[PDB]
Write a protein that binds this ligand. Structure first.
Ligand code: HEM
Length: 195
């Protein structure tokens, strides 16, 4: 995985989740020393896998929930570190850029393997999002979405539409329903218009 994002995981992981004791043992004493790189440096793997397991072991939490919770708070952590993307959007626009954004992030960033996050309006109060990846981080994906609902303060329901595997990738499609509709029909204009 890439250096930066792994930054947040540890940040968000200690920021509010268990203490510096629970994870600073898996972290600066799981097997490794205290601190990733940051700039755009690379990192390892599968060690995130086992620190997360030892956090699940360490707290009383299934590891999938650890992941989800990270995703929730990791949206503020994201908001804190370098938040050009937040300024000026409602929830929807923000989700819909996320694909373009994950690509850009990887454009000139060799080796990067970010997910695909294709969204599509399906109703005055609903979009559909599809996560596609060789990793199956379904829980982190769900959390981010809820973490977003919280930061932008717009209530939602999320529901799984389907899931599958195609050409070696894992997919998960969800339907995100908004409390207050985010699209509208405009008079002589076809289709759901971003109200
Ligand atoms: C709601 C918004 C987001 C969702 C749903 C989301 C979802 C995800 C997921 C599930 C992963 C790892 C998935 C995989 O390939 O297994 C990922 C990784 C990452 N995300 Fe996001 N993310 C979001 C927001 C952000 C934001 C705001 C940033 C920074 C602007 C960001 C940058 C990254 C990067 C760089 C990675 C890892 C790329 C790599 O592996 O090299 N994401 N995202």
């Amino acid at each position: 995985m890439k250096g930066t994002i792994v930054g947040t995981w540890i940040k968000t992981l200690r920021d509010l989740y268990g203490n510096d004791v629970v994870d600073e043992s898996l972290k600066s004493v799981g097997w490794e020393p205290d601190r990733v790189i940051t700039p755009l440096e690379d990192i390892d793997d599968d060690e995130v896998r086992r620190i997360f397991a030892k956090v699940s072991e360490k707290t009383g939490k299934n590891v999938n929930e650890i992941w989800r919770e990270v995703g929730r708070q990791n949206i503020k952590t994201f908001s804190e570190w370098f938040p050009s993307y937040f300024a000026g959007r409602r929830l929807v626009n923000f989700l819909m850029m996320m694909d373009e954004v994950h690509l850009q992030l990887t454009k000139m960033i060799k080796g990067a393997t970010p997910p695909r996050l294709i969204a599509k309006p399906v109703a005055k109060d609903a979009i559909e999002m599809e996560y596609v990846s060789k990793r199956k981080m379904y829980d982190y994906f769900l959390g981010l979405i809820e973490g977003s609902s919280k930061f932008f303060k717009e209530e939602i329901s999320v529901e799984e539409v389907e899931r599958g595997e195609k050409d070696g990738f894992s997919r998960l499609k969800v339907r995100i329903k908004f409390k207050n509709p985010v699209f509208e029909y405009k008079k002589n204009v076809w289709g759901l218009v971003p109200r």
